[PDB]
Ligand binder design. Structure first.
Ligand code: HEM
Ligand code: HEM
Ligand SMILES: [Cl-]
Ligand SMILES: [Cl-]
Ligand SMILES: [Cl-]
Ligand SMILES: [Cl-]
Ligand SMILES: [Cl-]
Ligand SMILES: [Cl-]
Ligand code: NA
Ligand code: NA
Lengths: 480, 480, 480, 480
């Protein structure tokens, strides 16, 4: 047995009645319990994530099968058998916190590894490419996909406007409007790092790397009609499914694979290997197994752990570095920036975000300082040998720069249509049919000039793709 | 034609490419446009409302048909034909932004009248009673109804635990589990002030009042299966319907009716007229027509106007006062409290929240001061005749107190079951069948002791009600 | 030895150089250490206290000498020898955080007692009365005293305007413009609860109480000229002195005394005993020794402990209750209200604010949830015997109300001048001269009508007082 | 005459008395005016600036005397006679709001020019160099100079520790410890841009530039004894002086001069011309007159205009660009970053911060959206010709990069001591005496090892300088 108390630690005598002028009179201001309890209630909510607002989290373990020390000095990958705790959040993208998990969207696949040399965040999605290749466009892209700012309803005319005029999107759309646009749940789902990263070994040698997560539960997708039928009765079915698997002891897992490419292959290719609208051939750059992640524990409190979880692509660890991918570059900034707003200056002290590795630095203060700071020395350099010092063993690599000027200029070899055609042609006939069906349902109401431009983009990917879509939309494209 | 600019007013030379080391290198910190645009994007979201997070707004006009000056000095009600502008937000209650509008819930019905003596907010719901009668219980009620804090899924076993142990909820639950728990949309829906308020006339005479809104479009509800059919294909169907009606010129309207009761009728009733778990008889206190509200304009920007709208039951105008209702009393505090957090100290300067009536006072400063303040005098009393002064014509009434001590104690005559039985018996056979069906579906998985207590509460309301529910649940109540 | 790390726990290779395009080129975005370190720096500050911004804190112990159980059930006062930990902040009032401690002002004397039945805050000042007697006036008062909102400089013409038109201020001003308006430092200083409170014993019997702190170091003040001499060379002399005393083991101490008055003495007096512009006679209501507080430890971090400390007059413990004093009644609200803005919704989790007593309740979430919450049950009533429950042993008293209506009306027997005259007459001739000197320096530049009203208010206190001030100001009051 | 009103626009009947249970009873919760008024009071304060918290602002006009079109295409400098409105804030650096203006510190000299092509901020200080040359060190530098995080008192042992170990500081200290470390006020004070910037003309040709402001009132400084004398009687003498000059029509003015250097001069100098610890010889790069700024108008509200004013070095206009200076580079980030925290995401809508030039972009929402947004299109590219578009006439230059690799490495030719010696030797004998006096008073209580290192640093600047300091400190440096 325990007393109900105020936040001052005073036991509460009555948690049923406000203090009033007799049993039926108006309420008095001197009711600390009422005021404190209402005021805290009044302040429960914090801003939702600007994208990926809807999601679900779980803890688990990653275990190395094949050590990667020949390619990366990353401590958590250094030895067979080595286990690292993780926290993972899965999500949709566009709609708000309470929105259904049956909508078409990429799914987020955000892993925080609690390594002995710091937290490593790999902030992936299920689909392995993106719509755009420069972060400057992200707010535009998002605003086009988001509910209309007048009506609060998503409008395909808006996002198809932006996407058609951003033809690098063509490959992504070709995946998003397959039925993999609606994964059956979070467990039966791919994961991808999307970007190329740099792995740097103890000798300072660099490779390009791509990450891939392969579900032990297999990949399964929903048709539009299957998604609708689930939506009718459950708007949180993927959150449900994840919690339930774990509660039952049926732990979902993914095998981690990487591809590795020499920096010097840039000139051997007809696309930029750091363009995130591109994949790398699995034939030319085969998948190499690293290990397995198993999710085996639900959080204790959804708000404190899942809703307040903060992941950033810039939470890198020694031996793993950003590539020059311009989309990735902006992310390095935007996540910690949004997290300071959403969660507070000290969000890194929220338990789920805390490293296992020691934190020692000269940062101080900020809202909600709860860590019991002490000491006179909050600056470096200083004269004290016992105060924290830099450690040059942990310097990052020095990538070579090929440019001689500060420029704003698109990459060379953008090659916006080729891989979209290759993906189209890789689909089974059933999959192609589902693609055309999903695209047609989405495009049929949009502005005619935009609709034509969409058809033309997919035609450039593959003539059959474009012609089928034109036919299904009742657009005559003879004349182009 | 317009230039795209930064917030500094500098025209943007390139809104496509980040600034980089050559055409494919890493990104530079000196890209003010990139950083300003990402940083503002990163800060678009603010906290959703703690309850009623999902909703939709519209503007319109209220016109008086019968002047109410005999009963209230309220300026906006003073004469036939008088028109006052309104803003109205409709909502669900429990689930977040983005959640479907097909869920079972009260609906919010919040009206802001822009009067010549200040803004008057009548912050209603569709249903005319509430689950509880003291604001001290509101965070408890809400937390039981809200998604489980571990699973993020709503759990009937949790809110039924609370409700069964809070038998004053029995009347409300008898309305909420009729099909009126799922209105067809926001236009074909009842509105209620719920609480008794006080109307005070120019002679200082007070009457108790209840407000009622009657839809010109009729009341229409959804069965569970009708709601599921809509939910399959649209999770924002009520927001859609409202916008579309107005955009088409098919303006929805509601007639405003009041009931009026002498203060002296308290003592002879077998309930407390200021208990918000009670209605008043429409035979004994007939509905009296006041006027009509027509909604005829969608907002220009959903965030700025609908999301940032702030209503409070304490936004009262001369001639309309709070009653002693202990649930109302807390609301008077909680709304402007939460709004300071959700919207900022200066939320009353956000355009939708601004009065039409002049605002002059000695308040100052606060986050986001945008009003161009001036003058040396921000204190009263002062020696300056031209500075704002109090006006004793606008004093509120002096309600009589019946109590002689500061107490925490339940009202007399709580009478938790009688009106629930009267409501049950007023249902058609089809409506009773739907009630029992909706209750059974909700209760069938809850803890057996809780399920029994629920049955017993509805049995006390009406023996046929309780026995039918026991039967439908397969629960043997013989030994009770 | 320790590595300097990021907040992710990654050791920092170089804490001297930003990452750049060669050794002299512009800076890259991909510099997580730079951006994290600057972004946290950029957010170090929180709002200062709206008043009492400048202050200093220390920890100590309070020890009971005479148990008070005959008069109050307060646990921390229950036994001779009983020790309770404290945290104390001393302060000036009007000017901002970095302002000098040599200015004229009341001094704050805020004591947080970490009791076994919760935190008790006695939020006092040095001077034993106040300017005003209703919280509605506090923003006005403060705005008049604060730097002019145009010039950022305090103007006596502004606060004398207010004070002269608020004649209840006369007693306070008679103490404030003695040399006790500038204490020599925070150790050689009086402390007062100011308000009357209610003490309730285990039988439910109530007495009125007044609290007084008497410094072991004696009371010592500065003249205007002595204060200027200190200010020339140190603008934080009192903060310095407190820290230095404690660091060198010269712990400052205060003896706590109370006065006790029956509720039934209200009619026996020519002032309202809950008017905080009044003191109680030490002859008629003798000082009774309670115990001693010794301050013996400086904080480890000033921001985390002193700057983030939150005290409230509403942090009452069983056996100690508010009186009806209308100034105190507003304070009960204002302190936790401002603290939620200044410090966050979860400010009660910041270590210095945490109780020693257990905290268990159903509150949740809010910015910066750092406490590792768990469990499914966040609502009461509930079916679970082990969850926290109310404890009726801890109900507060039920004060009798003498009013029969809700009114806005000044107290009876305001008696604004009598005690001011008594205080004036209690001064030595030297002290009277210092009072007249200090008043004259302050009033000599103000508006002539205001200056005459000030003279008239002090005349009504005592004719000699008024006449001396009129003489010193060159104002002829013979015509009146 | 005006009514005092609530923020709802309801006239207030009584601004003196809270609502209570009879004339002396406790206070009621149903007192919207009391609560609204206390709650806004409770929220008046925002965080102070992390540095330069103490300051004062004024408006004025800048007039071009000599067009600068040979060297920059900046619109505001394009024609003789062209007038641009400005807002200017002057400040100290280290201590909080409220702190004295008689302390040793650089002073801030921040000018916002409201140009036809956007707001241009030149965020200067009086002294023309800085302590450090990389932004990564700024929080360290500041934390060393700030009050000790334990004692809340500035400690020379702390900042001398940092500075001695940061020998690039030697030139700055040789200025700061002249009497120019304490300007007499803000009007009789130098201004400097400190950094090298880039000026780009209509042909795309670039020069390096430095900015200098020369007071029409002449430069005047305070000795330590003069500063103490002012501090005794006034802790805000500079804020007072600036206001008072303007109020009386004695407008202070500064002439703007520039120095111009070819980019190609880098390679021939024995220092880096973008090292902000360095000045450029006025013999080799003569001062060239641009125009004059006159400050002629005080703000109407200090909080809304001066306290909320936001300047950034990244508020550049066409023809004026950042240089590669690594200290400047980090400022480009830090200012808008802190401002979003201190002021809100929408701080650029606060009136003092608004451009005169039109703002049109696709940003949206954020706390306190007051600007009445409208329209369906908040994304680019889009199909609408009338929506805002990029304008390639306004592209910035493409600076050449001399580096091969992303590196963390000190600039070449740091040359930490030469210019410090030159400055020393340029002082009059009186000025050298004052320098040594001021240094000696600061260093005499510092740790011996630190004190010796300081002496050594100044000795390397100039043997006489170091030896005089050592002699004054009683340190025998013969052995070295
Ligand atoms: C320039 C491109 C992008 C920008 C600017 C961007 C920005 C953001 C921001 C601001 C958030 C909210 C973060 C938070 O509140 O902590 C977010 C969430 C997220 N984004 Fe992105 N994003 C971009 C591209 C991508 C890409 C390529 C992926 C996947 C490869 C991705 C996956 C995610 C995921 C999974 C989340 C949710 C993380 C979580 O579960 O907590 N985004 N993004
Ligand atoms: C990396 C070096 C520096 C950093 C990181 C930095 C950072 C900051 C920050 C965060 C502020 C607060 C701004 C606000 O809240 O609006 C500030 C204020 C200021 N700093 Fe710096 N600063 C640096 C160097 C300098 C330099 C070299 C100068 C002058 C040349 C300078 C002059 C100022 C001034 C004048 C202000 C006051 C602006 C105002 O009146 O609002 N700072 N600094
Ligand atoms: Cl922020
Ligand atoms: Cl650090
Ligand atoms: Cl006011
Ligand atoms: Cl708040
Ligand atoms: Cl609670
Ligand atoms: Cl934009
Ligand atoms: Na009439
Ligand atoms: Na005793």
């Amino acid at each position: 047995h325990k007393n109900l108390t105020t936040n001052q630690g005073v036991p509460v005598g009555d948690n049923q009645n406000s203090r009033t002028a007799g049993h039926r009179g108006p309420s008095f201001l001197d009711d600390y319990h009422l005021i404190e309890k209402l005021a805290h209630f009044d302040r429960e909510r914090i801003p939702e994530r600007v994208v990926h607002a809807r999601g679900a989290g779980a803890y688990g373990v990653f275990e190395v099968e094949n050590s990667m020390e020949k390619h990366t000095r990353a401590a958590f990958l250094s030895e067979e058998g080595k286990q690292t705790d993780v926290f993972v959040r899965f999500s949709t993208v566009i709609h708000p916190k309470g929105s259904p998990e049956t909508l078409r969207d990429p799914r987020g696949f955000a892993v925080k590894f609690y390594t002995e040399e710091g937290n490593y965040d790999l902030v992936g999605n299920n689909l392995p490419i993106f719509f755009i290749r420069d972060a400057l466009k992200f707010p535009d892209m998002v605003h086009s996909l988001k509910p209309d700012p007048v009506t609060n309803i998503q409008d395909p005319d808006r996002y198809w406007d932006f996407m058609t005029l951003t033809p690098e999107s063509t490959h992504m759309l070709t995946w998003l409007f397959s039925d993999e646009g609606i994964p059956a749940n979070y467990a039966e789902m791919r994961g991808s790092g999307v970007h190329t990263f740099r792995w740097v070994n103890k000798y300072g040698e660099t490779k390009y790397v791509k990450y891939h997560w392969r579900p032990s539960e297999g990949i399964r997708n929903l048709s539009m009609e299957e998604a609708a039928e689930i939506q009718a009765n459950d708007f949180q079915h993927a959150t449900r499914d994840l919690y339930d698997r774990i509660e039952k002891g049926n732990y979902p897992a993914w095998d981690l694979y990487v591809q590795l490419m020499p920096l010097s292959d840039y000139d051997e290719l007809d696309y930029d290997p750091c363009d995130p609208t591109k994949t790398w051939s699995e034939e030319d750059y085969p998948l190499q197994k690293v290990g397995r992640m198993t999710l085996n524990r639900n959080p204790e409190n959804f708000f404190a752990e899942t809703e307040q979880a903060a992941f950033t692509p810039s939470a890198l660890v020694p031996g793993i570095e950003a590539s020059e991918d311009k989309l990735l570059q902006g992310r390095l900034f935007s996540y910690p920036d949004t997290q300071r707003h959403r969660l507070g200056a000290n969000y890194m002290r929220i338990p789920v975000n805390c490293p296992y590795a020691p934190v020692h630095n000269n940062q101080q203060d900020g809202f909600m300082t709860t860590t019991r700071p002490s000491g006179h020395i909050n600056y470096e350099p200083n004269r004290y040998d016992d105060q924290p010092k830099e450690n040059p063993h942990y310097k990052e690599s020095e990538p070579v720069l090929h440019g001689d000027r500060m420029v704003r200029q698109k990459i060379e070899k953008p090659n916006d249509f080729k891989q979209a055609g290759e993906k189209y042609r890789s689909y089974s006939e059933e999959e192609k049919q589902a693609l055309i069906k999903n695209l047609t349902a989405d495009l049929k109401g949009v502005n005619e000039k935009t609709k034509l431009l969409a058809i033309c983009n997919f035609y450039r990917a593959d003539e059959d793709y474009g012609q089928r879509l034109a036919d299904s939309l009742g657009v005559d494209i003879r004349s182009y």
